[PDB]
Design an enzyme around this catalytic site. Sequence first.
Site, PDB file in Angstrom:
ATOM      1  N   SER A 166      -6.077 -12.835  -3.678  1.00 39.04           N
ATOM      2  CA  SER A 166      -4.973 -13.023  -2.769  1.00 39.04           C
ATOM      3  C   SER A 166      -5.185 -12.167  -1.524  1.00 39.04           C
ATOM      4  O   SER A 166      -5.070 -12.659  -0.412  1.00 39.04           O
ATOM      5  CB  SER A 166      -3.666 -12.628  -3.477  1.00 39.04           C
ATOM      6  OG  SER A 166      -2.553 -12.558  -2.586  1.00 39.04           O
ATOM      7  N   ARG A 226       2.912 -17.410  -7.697  1.00 35.79           N
ATOM      8  CA  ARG A 226       2.721 -16.108  -8.340  1.00 35.79           C
ATOM      9  C   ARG A 226       4.017 -15.307  -8.468  1.00 35.79           C
ATOM     10  O   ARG A 226       4.338 -14.762  -9.527  1.00 35.79           O
ATOM     11  CB  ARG A 226       1.731 -15.266  -7.545  1.00 35.79           C
ATOM     12  CG  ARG A 226       0.334 -15.811  -7.496  1.00 35.79           C
ATOM     13  CD  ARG A 226      -0.579 -14.935  -8.316  1.00 35.79           C
ATOM     14  NE  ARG A 226      -0.461 -13.524  -7.960  1.00 35.79           N
ATOM     15  CZ  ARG A 226      -0.810 -13.019  -6.785  1.00 35.79           C
ATOM     16  NH1 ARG A 226      -1.302 -13.813  -5.842  1.00 35.79           N
ATOM     17  NH2 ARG A 226      -0.674 -11.721  -6.564  1.00 35.79           N
ATOM     18  N   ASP A 278      -7.305  -3.749  10.125  1.00 37.28           N
ATOM     19  CA  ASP A 278      -6.130  -4.197   9.379  1.00 37.28           C
ATOM     20  C   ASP A 278      -5.958  -3.335   8.128  1.00 37.28           C
ATOM     21  O   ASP A 278      -6.900  -2.697   7.661  1.00 37.28           O
ATOM     22  CB  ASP A 278      -6.303  -5.674   8.969  1.00 37.28           C
ATOM     23  CG  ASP A 278      -4.976  -6.386   8.694  1.00 37.28           C
ATOM     24  OD1 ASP A 278      -4.984  -7.630   8.673  1.00 37.28           O
ATOM     25  OD2 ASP A 278      -3.933  -5.728   8.497  1.00 37.28           O
ATOM     26  N   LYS A 279      -4.736  -3.310   7.607  1.00 34.92           N
ATOM     27  CA  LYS A 279      -4.421  -2.580   6.387  1.00 34.92           C
ATOM     28  C   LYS A 279      -3.599  -3.577   5.581  1.00 34.92           C
ATOM     29  O   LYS A 279      -2.972  -4.460   6.162  1.00 34.92           O
ATOM     30  CB  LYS A 279      -3.592  -1.316   6.685  1.00 34.92           C
ATOM     31  CG  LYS A 279      -2.072  -1.511   6.749  1.00 34.92           C
ATOM     32  CD  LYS A 279      -1.389  -1.336   5.388  1.00 34.92           C
ATOM     33  CE  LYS A 279       0.077  -1.770   5.453  1.00 34.92           C
ATOM     34  NZ  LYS A 279       0.848  -1.499   4.206  1.00 34.92           N
ATOM     35  N   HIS A 280      -3.615  -3.449   4.255  1.00 37.94           N
ATOM     36  CA  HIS A 280      -2.856  -4.350   3.395  1.00 37.94           C
ATOM     37  C   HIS A 280      -2.348  -3.671   2.131  1.00 37.94           C
ATOM     38  O   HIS A 280      -3.134  -3.167   1.340  1.00 37.94           O
ATOM     39  CB  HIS A 280      -3.708  -5.546   2.993  1.00 37.94           C
ATOM     40  CG  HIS A 280      -2.905  -6.729   2.574  1.00 37.94           C
ATOM     41  ND1 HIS A 280      -2.244  -7.532   3.477  1.00 37.94           N
ATOM     42  CD2 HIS A 280      -2.605  -7.214   1.349  1.00 37.94           C
ATOM     43  CE1 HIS A 280      -1.570  -8.463   2.827  1.00 37.94           C
ATOM     44  NE2 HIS A 280      -1.772  -8.292   1.533  1.00 37.94           N
ATOM     45  N   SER A 281      -1.041  -3.721   1.863  1.00 34.69           N
ATOM     46  CA  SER A 281      -0.479  -3.120   0.631  1.00 34.69           C
ATOM     47  C   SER A 281      -0.461  -4.059  -0.598  1.00 34.69           C
ATOM     48  O   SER A 281      -0.854  -5.221  -0.488  1.00 34.69           O
ATOM     49  CB  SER A 281       0.928  -2.580   0.896  1.00 34.69           C
ATOM     50  OG  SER A 281       1.623  -2.349  -0.317  1.00 34.69           O
ATOM     51  N   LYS A 333      -7.323 -13.306   2.617  1.00 41.14           N
ATOM     52  CA  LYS A 333      -6.643 -13.281   3.901  1.00 41.14           C
ATOM     53  C   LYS A 333      -7.417 -12.394   4.850  1.00 41.14           C
ATOM     54  O   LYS A 333      -7.815 -12.826   5.927  1.00 41.14           O
ATOM     55  CB  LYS A 333      -5.221 -12.742   3.757  1.00 41.14           C
ATOM     56  CG  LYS A 333      -4.223 -13.763   3.280  1.00 41.14           C
ATOM     57  CD  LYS A 333      -2.795 -13.242   3.392  1.00 41.14           C
ATOM     58  CE  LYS A 333      -2.413 -12.317   2.240  1.00 41.14           C
ATOM     59  NZ  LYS A 333      -2.215 -13.041   0.943  1.00 41.14           N
ATOM     60  N   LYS A 334      -7.639 -11.149   4.444  1.00 39.63           N
ATOM     61  CA  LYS A 334      -8.356 -10.199   5.282  1.00 39.63           C
ATOM     62  C   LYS A 334      -9.751 -10.731   5.695  1.00 39.63           C
ATOM     63  O   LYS A 334     -10.238 -10.444   6.800  1.00 39.63           O
ATOM     64  CB  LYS A 334      -8.457  -8.861   4.541  1.00 39.63           C
ATOM     65  CG  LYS A 334      -7.151  -8.413   3.859  1.00 39.63           C
ATOM     66  CD  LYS A 334      -6.017  -7.977   4.813  1.00 39.63           C
ATOM     67  CE  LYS A 334      -5.359  -9.156   5.514  1.00 39.63           C
ATOM     68  NZ  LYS A 334      -4.000  -8.854   6.050  1.00 39.63           N
ATOM     69  N   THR A 360       6.510  -7.977   3.953  1.00 41.03           N
ATOM     70  CA  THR A 360       6.661  -7.674   5.365  1.00 41.03           C
ATOM     71  C   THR A 360       6.890  -8.939   6.216  1.00 41.03           C
ATOM     72  O   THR A 360       7.345  -8.844   7.345  1.00 41.03           O
ATOM     73  CB  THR A 360       5.444  -6.850   5.889  1.00 41.03           C
ATOM     74  OG1 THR A 360       4.320  -7.705   6.097  1.00 41.03           O
ATOM     75  CG2 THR A 360       5.060  -5.782   4.867  1.00 41.03           C
TER      76      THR A 360
END
Length: 448
Positions: A186, A171, A83-86, A190-191, A123
């Site tokens: 945050s 937030r 997974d990737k997260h911005s 999740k990850k 997203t």
Amino acid sequence: EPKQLPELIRMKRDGGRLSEADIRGFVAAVVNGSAQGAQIGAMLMAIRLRGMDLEETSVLTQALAQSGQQLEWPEAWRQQLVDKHSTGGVGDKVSLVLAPALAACGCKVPMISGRGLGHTGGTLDKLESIPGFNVIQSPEQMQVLLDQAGCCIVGQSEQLVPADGILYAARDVTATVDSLPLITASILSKKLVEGLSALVVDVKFGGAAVFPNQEQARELAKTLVGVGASLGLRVAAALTAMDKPLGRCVGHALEVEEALLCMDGAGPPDLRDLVTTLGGALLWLSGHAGTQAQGAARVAAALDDGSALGRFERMLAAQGVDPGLARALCSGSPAERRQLLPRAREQEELLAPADGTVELVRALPLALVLHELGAGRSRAGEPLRLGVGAELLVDVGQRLRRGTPWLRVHRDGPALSGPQSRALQEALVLSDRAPFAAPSPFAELVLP
């Protein structure tokens, strides 16, 4: 021990540390219902003004994570979960492509994502442009999705990182987003709940990024990789520029289109750059590709041969989208996809004032105006104008002519106000410099 809520808040207000007991109890109050709205904002504000430390921070994230469930998948998939997260993000649809991309590369992506944060669309909202897209699945469903589709994108819920869902909404409309701790928690939370073999984090910097300052952003990188390490997660963080919108579409539906254009063949260079770059990192990191180049090379491949378009199609359908619509959306021409997704009422175009060479388009002014236009949230739980958004008609580094259109605005109201107009028009910066090729928005890659 169990301290009344106002009391924990008083402590943070006074710059005091919150104990593991104190953070946990709080997290619980938030999910169990006891904690009242004005209480959650008060605490978030206090945190946004006194911060926390490695421990509290590490404790917070760790707790948030367990407010709900953790996922377990067939041991087969194990080494393939990535997974990737911005963070920041103006026009960052990378996720809408890198997901099906990886799923075409033999990887499984259980993505817990999010909605617009502050002035950075999310997203999750973008996907809701597609009619019938369900962002909420139970762990069960998710496992069916990684089997059929190989990927999936879903948001917090009653079973997954519940508490994070509560705060994350606040937030954004509390002016409590820019906080290294609330950010680290945050995200990592999740990850975590996913349990991945490898994880890449997109850390934006400059212009319209949550944390503008490049270095003060680079810290956020060593940090997520930092705590993430301890939590027991393999984390790679890359700093990518965010001074100008990624791609050419900023919005929601518009962005879902510029994503399909990628899987198609190829749309914007910067968009592709990151999808392949970041994508290749995940393969290298998850030890699924010799080097990043090789990694990145296979993803690009997916982009070019309809793979990602396929995986993506299964995904929409697999997540509530009328199968028909989904084959139409993917195999559809751009003109088709426009008539199938939410379009705004009218749409005007800003013309170029002077002859010159597009140096860059200011991302912040854009995101900020579009936000006012309904592409952003003002108060949690509210609908969003999914048609609204913006199209970049010129590409940075190129030369345009006085009078030419350079940006088109899709609005649902009868017009832009003076302030909003001037705002837009000045987000355009021109030089006399000779045209040039756009650079990659990819900077460094902080490793674990």
